[PDB]
C-alpha cells in the first residue's frame, strides 16, 4: 500500500474522483479509471494559509497533451502557446507553465487550501506484506475445518 499527498483548493476536490476533467485532473494528477483503495481530504485553513497570503504553492496550467494516469515527474521548461518559436524569456504567446496560489483567512469556502491523501493497492495476488490485526491460531490437519 502506498499513499500520495499534496495540497489542493477545495473547489477542485471533485476532480480527484476517476472520470473527471479539468486543469488539475489533466495536467497535474490523473487517476486511472479502475481504482482500488480510496482518498481522504479535509480542510486545512488554520495551518497552511497565511494572513498576507501563501505563494509557495505551484500548479501547472499548460501542457502539450493530457498526461497518462499516475505521472509524477515535472519539467519547468518554457511553454509556447502560438506557432511563434520562443526562447529565453516568456511573453507574447509564451506562458510560464506554472502558477501560484493565494490563501487568505478572509477568503470564503472553496478557496481555503485542503490537504489530500490518496490510498491505492492491489488485492491478494502476491505474498501479502500489510495485514490487518487479528490473532493467529494453530494449524490443524486432516479434519473438516473452516480455514
Amino acid at each position: 500500500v502506498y499513499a500520495d499527498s499534496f495540497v489542493i483548493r477545495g473547489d477542485e476536490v471533485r476532480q480527484i474522483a476517476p472520470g473527471q476533467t479539468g486543469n488539475i485532473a489533466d495536467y497535474n494528477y490523473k487517476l486511472p479509471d479502475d481504482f482500488t483503495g480510496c482518498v481522504i481530504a479535509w480542510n486545512s485553513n488554520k495551518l497552511d494559509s497565511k494572513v498576507s497570503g501563501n505563494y509557495n504553492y505551484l500548479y501547472r496550467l499548460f501542457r502539450k497533451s493530457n498526461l497518462k494516469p499516475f505521472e509524477r515527474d515535472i519539467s519547468t521548461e518554457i511553454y509556447q502557446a502560438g506557432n511563434k518559436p520562443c526562447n529565453g524569456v516568456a511573453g507574447f504567446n509564451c506562458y510560464f507553465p506554472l502558477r501560484s496560489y493565494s490563501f487568505r483567512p478572509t477568503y470564503g469556502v472553496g478557496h481555503q487550501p485542503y490537504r489530500v491523501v490518496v490510498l491505492s493497492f492491489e488485492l491478494l495476488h502476491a505474498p501479502a506484506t500489510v495485514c490487518g490485526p487479528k490473532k493467529s491460531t494453530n494449524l490443524v490437519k486432516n479434519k473438516c475445518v473452516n480455514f
Epitope: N45, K46, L47, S49, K50, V51, S52, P105, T106, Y107, G108
Partner: antibody, heavy 119, light 109 residues
Framework: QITLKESGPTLVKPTQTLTLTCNFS??????????VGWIRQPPGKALEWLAL???????RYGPFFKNKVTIAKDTSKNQVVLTMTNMDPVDTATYYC???????????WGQGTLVTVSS | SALTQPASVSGSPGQSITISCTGT?????????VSWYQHHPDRAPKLLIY???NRPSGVSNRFSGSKSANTASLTISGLQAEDEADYYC???????????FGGGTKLTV
Amino acid sequence: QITLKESGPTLVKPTQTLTLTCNFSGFSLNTYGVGVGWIRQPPGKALEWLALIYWDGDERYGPFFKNKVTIAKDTSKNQVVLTMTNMDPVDTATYYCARHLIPTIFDYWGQGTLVTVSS
Amino acid sequence: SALTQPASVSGSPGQSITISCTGTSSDVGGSNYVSWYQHHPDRAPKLLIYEVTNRPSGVSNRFSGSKSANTASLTISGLQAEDEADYYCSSYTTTSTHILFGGGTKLTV
C-alpha cells in the same frame, strides 16, 4: 513557558533613528505556522499595528510604514530586531511584541516599553 | 482608521452588561474572526475571545460573545471589582491586517 521581553532606548531625538529588540524565550520561532508581530499604542488613543514576520522568512509590514520599519530574526539567540525611522511626537507610544497565529490572531503579549521623542 | 468602538459602558455589580464593537461589513469581510481582549492597567493585555462565542484555556464562564451582522457584542454576567478595565475588539480585515479599535472601558457601582 514563553515570555516576550522588549528592550531599547526610551528617549529619542526626532532626527535620530530608533532600534528595538524583542527577546522571546519559550518557543522556537522556526516551527511551521507561528509568527510574531509588533503593536504600538500612543497615549490617549487606540493601538496601532506595525508589522509581523513569519516562521519561514515571510515579512508583512504596515501599509504606511513599509520604508520606516525593517524586521529581522535570529532563532539562534531567539531574538527579533525592528528598526523605525523619522519618528514623530505623535509616534510616541507603548510598544509590544506578540506571538501571532491564524485561528487566534494574537495570544500572548510582551509587557512593552514606552517610547517618547524629545531632545 | 475606518473601524470604531464605543469607549464607555456602565452597569451594576452582580448583574449582566454588554458592550459592542462596530465597523463596516465590507472591510471585515464575510469571515469574521471576532476577538476580544481585556486590559487592566499596569500589565499587558491577554485574550478572552478568539472565535465566535469561544474562550481558550483558563476560562471565565461569565464571559460571553455574539457576532451580529456588522457588530461584535461582549456580555458579562455577575460583575465584580475586576470589570474596571479597558476591553479591546479585534477583527481581521481585507485591505489591511488592521484592527485599530479604541477599546471599551467599563463602569460599575
